[PDB]
Amino acid sequence: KIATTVGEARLSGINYRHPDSALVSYPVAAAAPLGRLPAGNYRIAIVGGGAGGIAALYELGRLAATLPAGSGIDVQIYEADPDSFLHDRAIKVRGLKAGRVSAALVHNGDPASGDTIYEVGAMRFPEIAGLTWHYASAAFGDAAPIKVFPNPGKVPTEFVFGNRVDRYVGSDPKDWEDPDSPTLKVLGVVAGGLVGNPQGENVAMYPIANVDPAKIAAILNAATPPADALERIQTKYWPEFIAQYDGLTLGAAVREIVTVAFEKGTLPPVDGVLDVDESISYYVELFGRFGFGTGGFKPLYNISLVEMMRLILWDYSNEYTLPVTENVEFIRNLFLKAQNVGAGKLVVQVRQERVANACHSGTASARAQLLSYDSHNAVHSEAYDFVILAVPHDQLTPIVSRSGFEHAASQNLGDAGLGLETHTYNQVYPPLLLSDSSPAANARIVTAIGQLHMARSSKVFATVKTAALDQPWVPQWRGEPIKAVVSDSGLAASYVVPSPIVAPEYSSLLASYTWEDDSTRLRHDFGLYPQNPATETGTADGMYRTMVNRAYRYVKYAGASNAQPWWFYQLLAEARTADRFVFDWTTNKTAGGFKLDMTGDHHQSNLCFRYHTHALAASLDNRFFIASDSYSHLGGWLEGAFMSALNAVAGLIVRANRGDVSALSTEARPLVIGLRPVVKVPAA
Amino acid sequence: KIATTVGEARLSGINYRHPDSALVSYPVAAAAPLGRLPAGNYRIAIVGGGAGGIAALYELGRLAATLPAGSGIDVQIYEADPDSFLHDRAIKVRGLKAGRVSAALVHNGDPASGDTIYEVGAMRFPEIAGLTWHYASAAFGDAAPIKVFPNPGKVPTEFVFGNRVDRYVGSDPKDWEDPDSPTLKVLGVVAGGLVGNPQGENVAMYPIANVDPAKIAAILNAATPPADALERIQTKYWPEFIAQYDGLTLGAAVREIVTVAFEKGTLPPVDGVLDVDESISYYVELFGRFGFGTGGFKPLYNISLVEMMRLILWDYSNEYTLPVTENVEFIRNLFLKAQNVGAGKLVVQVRQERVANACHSGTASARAQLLSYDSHNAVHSEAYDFVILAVPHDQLTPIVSRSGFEHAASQNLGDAGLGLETHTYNQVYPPLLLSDSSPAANARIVTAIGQLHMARSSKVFATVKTAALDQPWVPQWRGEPIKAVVSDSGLAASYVVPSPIVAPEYSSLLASYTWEDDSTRLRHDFGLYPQNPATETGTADGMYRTMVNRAYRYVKYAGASNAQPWWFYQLLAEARTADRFVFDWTTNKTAGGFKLDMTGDHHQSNLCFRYHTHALAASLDNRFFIASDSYSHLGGWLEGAFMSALNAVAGLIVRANRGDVSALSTEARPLVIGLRPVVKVPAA
Ligand SMILES: Cc1cc2nc3c(=O)[nH]c(=O)nc-3n(C[C@H](O)[C@H](O)[C@H](O)COP(=O)(O)OP(=O)(O)OC[C@H]3O[C@@H](n4cnc5c(N)ncnc54)[C@H](O)[C@@H]3O)c2cc1C
Ligand SMILES: Cc1cc2nc3c(=O)[nH]c(=O)nc-3n(C[C@H](O)[C@H](O)[C@H](O)COP(=O)(O)OP(=O)(O)OC[C@H]3O[C@@H](n4cnc5c(N)ncnc54)[C@H](O)[C@@H]3O)c2cc1C
Ligand SMILES: Nc1ccccc1C(=O)O
Ligand SMILES: Nc1ccccc1C(=O)O
């Protein structure tokens, strides 16, 4: 049952279809090239060298290899991040970023002989992330070993909320220190109420298709689902769930579930003095700090229930590592494999330039324009046949939103407010061109993008000797030291991760991994933004000491009468002075970590997810596609960036074929035709 | 009719009762001293010299004057902010702050002859903010003149969302450039749906007591309601509204209202051509950017409907200025008045120290302990009879949450992780002491405080000649230039406010006032945190250029042949180079601007609002009270800070009288007994 290789994870998730794209398994769509292109010499730009852009490049490579003699694809990849791996062909980050897949290498002067790696962005990969594992197989092979990510509960864990402490491993109460824990009771109540049972009676509060979500998850993952089930999910049942529940937050749903359980007597008054509403509140907030398997989702309580349900269906918490020292190696290997698969028909050039503007203009074949600035702030203008905008939404906004929403005789585009040179474009149309006649339709996609929610996130790291865990002051549970701590201290979630450069001498002490308001509460103490230290030779000691100080709390345990300062204070203080670190995604140019949908946001994110269907309108001459986890129903996952890239390339194939969906492979067609189109075109 | 003096505003809202405290008009409670104290020589601490702490001092002065000969009150006021007015007897901030009432004086070398003031925090005051005006009258007199705050719609305004532009004043179509504007139509739909009609048919979607909120607002503002009506609101109908709608976001509510109106045919398909869900979505997001009279509430869409409904009942948008050059003068004048009214019986000393911990300890008469650090990090400990903790929630957390939840024989408290000196306290109980026997009751208050939502906010300012508004490219209405701009450019809300140091030569160009995700999106560009410039003589020129560059957008006006760069880009660029500024409340030690409740947050904030009722439990003997807008149902308003102060002093009086509510005035008594108690046992 535990996957031990890339191939075992890959095969576990190969069939899984997400509910907003329930007709199609993306890994099955990706098994062969996505389609065919007419003979030609295509000039394509990819803006962004992260997971989205690089997956898109790989699929373009697969398409290029199918082109006849004399034809080919030339791709210009724009990548503004000076630390990207694409520009590299104590704490080091240079060359160790692929967007939000971002490593920091801790070393003592020789980066080839390092101590540990801080995984600053992506770090844990669901088993049924089928497209992720599909690409991991392309990058590494099916035989490459993987490990269980050491989430809370997967290793011995301490949980602290208010007066409550729990030490546990797993969900078997035999392996909880207090089998009568209220935490365990609330967890069962919330699981019953949200997920329900895969067999038998339906007990969940928020059914899909009048059944528990556990039953729908099994259908979505089936090799051979019942006839019509996937269509009915896609067109009826999941839309009905959204109609009912997209206006309900995760926090509101947890409180409804808790309230019913408290009324029934399943959850008792917290002790003899708490009133009704206070007891209900305590349980809601207790569950909030505990979570679903990856730490407290209290900070994520404003997400739509729809968004949580996507993660429930996916079994999101059951996560693995990649077969790497640094996760960036996955994206770097995919980039190299893209060039190999192109078979010499794909040529790639990297531009260390920031794109400022996209538009359609002029009367040439190559009408998709990109205006960029290089590292000397010099302007460049380049025209393309097709462009894939592979950047998340706040980075995309300035590129797409400043050209208005209809034809313009001329525009002087660029970063004029910065004092940078502009370029005059003539006969201009917006880049995200949903209509030649309706400014509102053009506005809808732009405004949607600009109002997606980027979740805030920060990570505080230090380097500690792994042997620190063996000290008598670190608790042991079930034969191993505590290596995950979930708490209301302000740190939120903390992990003591063995170094992947190796039992290793060192561990990465992820002292605090925060989301949303948990991150906001810390931000004043970070000192430098987005990264402290901002240099390779510094250490964020002052910042880190503020985190240590949040851990300076008197904690009463059942095992001792006199409360002492929390042991975790001592462990955080055991970290070495050098190489203390924080990265704040919020103050990075991404304006946060990743998209999570609020109530009502489905309508915006889904528009983005379906945007590539514009290629069905042959009379619309739109050359731009979008490729990021921002434009998916899995913001915060490689799987979402990869899904979005698959969408983008499928749309581009249809556009290149002037609206002919038959140019997509049989298995890839549903990527376009299984969605509600964003343009109205005739049936069939 | 428009109010023209402090006294006119004061009388307007004198009776208004908020729905969570519907049995009391706070201005009426505050008219006479709140009660009486036994004879004695009291030693009190107030932590924080903002609006909460200073109003609490004022009320303690009033009490002090009533004490008999030989009795008195000594107050130690702790204020950590070096820029506080309390510590003061180009951009200058020193001496110009009272917490989140914060001015920046723009000058050329002589601060007595400045150019303009930037109101960095509080700036606009609802007419019906009765307690605010009550204190403004204490500070300035009833005769002092006030002005209508130049909100969007109160002065000529441009609104931009997607392809839609409107130019307007108020809500009469005759005063809109496009009287058939869809924007104005959606405002009527959403207002009808949320607020409804004060007379006639009930048209609102979310009734209170089965009627439109407008009807309830009239009852809550009556001199002589029903007695029965107030109690029924307090105990039945507002609680039922909470039960129903605390789990519904404002954004979800807006979409429900728009959906029904679109199905009825009150709103047309957008462009004649977007589909049903695209049309509804467009209208929801259009309304989101337009707002309720103070700019778009899109960034606030995650607040509960309960929270928005408090502001609807209060007519919050109808706002005025104070009779000052800088709003901090209000708080300074209240400080000075506190000392005058204490008639010699009040002694005040100011400490420039940061409180690190509070607790009860020991066996002496004075048990309420405060541990603090001065500006060079020396430790101080002092014991008091009573303590008012007048700091917002994130600042309160470290003070109250690190001592555990029950009796402890001894603790070494302080900022040990910062390397600062600790102090040993013996026989220690938590400061927010709700139980002698329940650690969960103690944990509930602490955990609630720590998880309140501090809304993010930032303000970008520059100095501009007022005459820039007379440039030919600045639009005008009846001779008056546009002075407010509400946009989806990233700037959110922009104002050109005439200097109060005076027609004035200069204006404060509030180039961007953002909340929540609107602020997050900008934050990467701020450069220095929380303030750029950090010095008096620097300028945030690079930051401000990024704001000019967000305004560099092609905007199409009706009738025009082509889009042209937005005129507002030109206006922003007219600001002088010197004195460009941002302040980010999020990276200040407050960890944001002010409390706004998410879905499910009622129970956390309401617990805090009712906390002072612990005074009813005589044997408990808890000496700590809390006083901030964080512990109110008006986070983001002085009114909330003042209400919480009034609560804190009322509770203090009851506690000083060993639980006897007859020590409060007849008018003040409901401050305590009109709320559900926080201690169920013992009764009181
Ligand atoms: C804190 C955090 C935790 C996460 N946890 C996980 C996890 O455990 N598992 C998982 O699967 N995923 C996780 N993710 C999500 C995963 O990192 C993202 O889904 C994925 O990396 C996003 O790829 P992308 O291509 O959409 O965007 P990005 O990674 O943001 O890449 C975009 C690229 O475009 C470039 N760029 C942007 N603007 C421009 C411009 N104007 N011109 C030129 N270049 C530009 C950028 O420099 C960047 O390299 C996490 C992310 C973060 C930040
Ligand atoms: C951007 C913004 C816009 C706003 N707009 C409006 C508006 O237009 N109208 C309106 O009525 N209100 C407005 N408000 C709200 C208003 O400013 C607040 O409600 C009010 O000022 C808060 O007072 P307070 O006493 O609760 O807290 P604060 O003002 O935060 O004061 C707390 C004080 O305690 C001190 N302190 C904190 N921690 C410690 C410690 N450990 N030891 C010692 N001292 C400490 C601080 O330095 C500070 O001086 C706005 C606020 C902001 C920030
Ligand atoms: N990567 C994520 C995205 C969304 C929510 C949680 C996670 C998590 O890793 O727990
Ligand atoms: N001061 C506020 C608090 C809450 C929401 C709006 C405002 C405003 O001034 O518009």
Short mmCIF file of C-alpha atoms and ligand atoms in Angstrom, two decimals, chain B residues 47-53 78-81 98-101 120-126 353-355 390-392 395 399 457 459 513 585 590 593-594 627-630 636-639 641, ligand 2:
data_model
loop_
_atom_site.label_atom_id
_atom_site.label_comp_id
_atom_site.label_asym_id
_atom_site.label_seq_id
_atom_site.Cartn_x
_atom_site.Cartn_y
_atom_site.Cartn_z
CA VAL B 47 -0.91 49.18 28.57
CA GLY B 48 -1.21 51.27 25.41
CA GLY B 49 -1.74 54.94 24.75
CA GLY B 50 -4.06 54.70 21.77
CA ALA B 51 -7.72 55.58 21.60
CA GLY B 52 -8.65 52.70 23.88
CA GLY B 53 -6.13 53.43 26.57
CA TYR B 78 2.96 51.95 29.12
CA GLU B 79 3.54 53.10 25.55
CA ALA B 80 6.19 51.36 23.47
CA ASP B 81 5.89 53.42 20.27
CA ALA B 98 -1.61 57.74 19.07
CA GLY B 99 -1.47 54.13 17.96
CA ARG B 100 -3.45 53.72 14.75
CA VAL B 101 -4.43 57.45 14.83
CA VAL B 120 -1.96 57.29 7.88
CA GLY B 121 -4.55 55.49 10.05
CA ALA B 122 -7.99 56.71 11.14
CA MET B 123 -9.48 59.43 8.92
CA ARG B 124 -13.28 59.42 8.49
CA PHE B 125 -15.84 59.32 11.24
CA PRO B 126 -19.49 58.10 10.87
CA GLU B 353 8.37 50.39 27.72
CA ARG B 354 7.10 47.38 25.88
CA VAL B 355 5.03 45.02 28.05
CA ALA B 390 -5.34 48.50 25.72
CA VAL B 391 -3.57 46.89 22.76
CA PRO B 392 -5.03 45.07 19.71
CA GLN B 395 0.01 42.69 20.30
CA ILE B 399 1.41 39.23 26.84
CA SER B 457 -4.08 47.68 4.99
CA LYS B 459 -1.60 53.75 2.34
CA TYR B 513 -5.65 53.01 0.16
CA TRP B 585 0.02 48.42 8.67
CA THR B 590 -0.09 45.53 14.92
CA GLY B 593 -4.87 47.66 10.28
CA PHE B 594 -7.88 46.57 12.30
CA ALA B 627 -9.65 47.83 25.76
CA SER B 628 -9.26 47.93 21.95
CA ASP B 629 -11.25 47.89 18.79
CA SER B 630 -10.12 44.21 18.55
CA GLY B 636 -11.67 49.59 12.28
CA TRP B 637 -13.45 52.44 14.09
CA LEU B 638 -12.57 54.66 17.01
CA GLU B 639 -16.09 53.84 18.08
CA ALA B 641 -11.92 51.27 20.69
C1 LIG C 2 -5.54 52.04 7.88
C2 LIG C 2 -6.50 52.34 9.03
C3 LIG C 2 -7.65 53.00 8.74
C4 LIG C 2 -8.60 53.30 9.71
N1 LIG C 2 -9.71 54.08 9.43
C5 LIG C 2 -10.55 54.57 10.40
C6 LIG C 2 -11.41 55.63 10.16
O1 LIG C 2 -11.44 56.28 9.08
N2 LIG C 2 -12.26 55.96 11.18
C7 LIG C 2 -12.17 55.42 12.47
O2 LIG C 2 -13.01 55.78 13.33
N3 LIG C 2 -11.21 54.50 12.71
C8 LIG C 2 -10.40 54.11 11.73
N4 LIG C 2 -9.44 53.23 12.01
C9 LIG C 2 -9.44 52.51 13.29
C10 LIG C 2 -8.80 53.28 14.43
O3 LIG C 2 -7.55 53.76 14.05
C11 LIG C 2 -8.71 52.35 15.61
O4 LIG C 2 -9.96 51.78 15.94
C12 LIG C 2 -8.15 52.89 16.91
O5 LIG C 2 -7.16 53.90 16.65
C13 LIG C 2 -7.54 51.76 17.70
O6 LIG C 2 -7.24 52.14 19.05
P1 LIG C 2 -6.77 51.01 20.07
O7 LIG C 2 -6.51 51.71 21.34
O8 LIG C 2 -7.67 49.84 19.99
O9 LIG C 2 -5.37 50.43 19.47
P2 LIG C 2 -4.04 51.13 18.89
O10 LIG C 2 -4.35 52.37 18.16
O11 LIG C 2 -3.37 50.03 18.14
O12 LIG C 2 -3.21 51.54 20.17
C14 LIG C 2 -2.55 50.59 20.94
C15 LIG C 2 -1.30 51.31 21.59
O13 LIG C 2 -0.64 50.31 22.41
C16 LIG C 2 0.81 50.45 22.18
N5 LIG C 2 1.35 49.12 22.46
C17 LIG C 2 1.10 48.01 21.77
N6 LIG C 2 1.64 46.92 22.27
C18 LIG C 2 2.31 47.40 23.38
C19 LIG C 2 3.08 46.77 24.33
N7 LIG C 2 3.34 45.44 24.35
N8 LIG C 2 3.59 47.51 25.36
C20 LIG C 2 3.37 48.88 25.33
N9 LIG C 2 2.66 49.59 24.44
C21 LIG C 2 2.15 48.80 23.46
C22 LIG C 2 0.94 50.90 20.75
O14 LIG C 2 2.19 51.47 20.47
C23 LIG C 2 -0.29 51.85 20.60
O15 LIG C 2 0.04 53.21 20.79
C24 LIG C 2 -8.39 52.94 11.05
C25 LIG C 2 -7.24 52.31 11.35
C26 LIG C 2 -6.25 52.04 10.39
C27 LIG C 2 -4.93 51.45 10.78
#
